[PDB]
């Protein structure tokens, strides 16, 4: 049912991932971990502290297809021992410091072609799809996640008993 997952997401803050690889999404959603570039390092953290639950969508580029969602559990935080992200060509370990705990909600793939008919308020009422760091609207984002299947592989509760 949506009840758990309605009430995860209400009042709640999205934000679209753009992925340059794969790798870092699947060694992402293993580990429950997240590294964004400074700009959008700070507006997570500002979101973070702001917001009832900080909603994540990821796309990795050129997939046409969203790769699931997740709920960051934490600021960004230095010093802890290096995750191994595949770095694109000009981005080096500094740029990706910043580590985000997260708790996946859905690892399942969600096409394009299943979201055409949503669009973002907050980008020029473009589709959802179209946007690193873009930030959605909160009905938008909450229609975007419902559309996502359920994902046996997750248990809400961790989420919903830290909130």
């Known amino acids: 049912?949506?009840?758990?997952l309605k009430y995860v997401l209400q009042d709640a803050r999205f934000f679209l991932i753009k992925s340059n690889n794969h790798e870092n999404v699947s060694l992402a959603k293993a580990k429950g971990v997240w590294s964004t570039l400074p700009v959008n390092e700070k507006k997570l953290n500002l979101a973070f502290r702001s917001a009832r639950s900080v909603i994540l969508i990821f796309s990795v580029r050129e997939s046409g297809k969203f790769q699931g969602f997740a709920r960051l559990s934490s600021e960004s935080h230095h010093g802890g021992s290096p995750i191994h992200?595949?770095?694109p060509a000009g981005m080096s370990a500094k740029m990706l410091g910043g580590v985000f705990k997260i708790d996946w909600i859905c690892r399942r793939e969600l096409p394009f072609t299943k979201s055409a008919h949503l669009t973002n308020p907050w980008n020029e009422h473009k589709?959802?799809?179209?946007?690193?760091?873009?930030?959605?609207?909160?009905?938008c984002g909450?229609?975007?996640?419902l559309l996502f299947p359920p994902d046996e592989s997750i248990d809400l509760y961790q989420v919903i008993h830290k909130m």
């Open 142 to 145: 909450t229609q975007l996640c």
């Open 85 to 87: 992200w595949v770095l």
């Open 127 to 139: 589709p959802v799809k179209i946007g690193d760091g873009q930030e959605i609207e909160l009905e």
């Open 1 to 4: 049912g949506t009840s758990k």
